């Protein structure tokens, strides 16, 4: 309605549809069912996207544990092993340690 109304008023004033309308109106209807459209659109992307997602295997699963498993590992504890309070907390995947699980 918005896109349509604006364009109508544009060709009712300038005797021509808005330059962007034809293409814009076509996107609106094509992605009317967003995921369905994008599922086919991403066929040629599937290779690179798959590789990226699959690499999450080394992160997501171990970042998505339960409270019991957190207690077993004594997560975030600084006093569980008193002799290492000086040692720097570190992994070879630093940014993956706090990367949002929600993301």
């Amino acid at each position: 309605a918005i896109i349509g109304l604006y364009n109508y008023a544009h060709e009712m004033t300038h005797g021509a549809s808005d330059r962007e309308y034809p293409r814009l109106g076509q996107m609106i209807v094509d992605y009317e069912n967003p995921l369905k459209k994008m599922m086919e659109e991403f066929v040629p992307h599937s290779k690179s996207l798959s590789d990226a997602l699959i690499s999450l295997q080394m992160v997501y699963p171990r970042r998505n544990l339960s409270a019991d498993q957190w207690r077993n590992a004594q997560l975030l504890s600084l006093i569980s092993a008193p002799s290492t309070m000086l040692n720097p907390a570190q992994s070879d995947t630093m940014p993956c340690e706090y990367l949002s699980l929600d993301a």
């Binding site: 006093i79 008193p82 002799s83 290492t84 309070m85 000086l86 720097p88």
Partner: protein, 144 residues
């Protein structure tokens, strides 16, 4: 301020920690001894026995907490206290038995009361008591 100057004997703070940061399992600081004492007075007594509060009032805890605060041990006391740990776990598993004639439920109910009291006192003392931070060195490459 003047009372803290009365606590210069090395027994209060104890020796330096092995990890170069703080004591954790060792019982060589006063607040640890206080934790043991707290364990004692949290123990429920007979229905017709007098309690520690009926005998000493809050004065006992004002003293214990004052020593802890003046020694600057209030933070580690909160983390390492025995009773606070028992309360923490009991609230998790919700278990209730009678260990050595000590009804766990009543035991943790009393611990909670003294916890509320201790927090109030410590906060008040800290409030009236209203710089340099000990930093650490990152790992050094054996080369240099």
């Amino acid at each position: 301020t003047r009372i803290r100057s009365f606590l210069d004997d090395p027994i209060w703070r104890g020796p330096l920690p092995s990890n170069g940061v703080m004591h954790v399992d060792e019982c060589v600081e006063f607040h640890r001894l206080w934790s043991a004492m707290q364990f004692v007075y949290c123990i429920p007594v007979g229905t017709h026995e007098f309690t520690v509060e009926q005998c000493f009032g809050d004065g006992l805890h004002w003293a214990g907490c004052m020593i802890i605060v003046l020694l600057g041990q209030q933070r580690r006391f909160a983390v390492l206290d025995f009773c606070y740990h028992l309360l923490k776990v009991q609230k998790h598993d919700g278990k209730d038995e009678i260990i050595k004639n000590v009804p766990l439920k009543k035991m943790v109910e009393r611990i909670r009361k003294f916890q509320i009291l201790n927090d109030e006192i410590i906060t008040i003392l800290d409030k009236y008591l209203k710089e340099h931070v000990r930093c650490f060195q990152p790992p050094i490459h054996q080369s240099l």
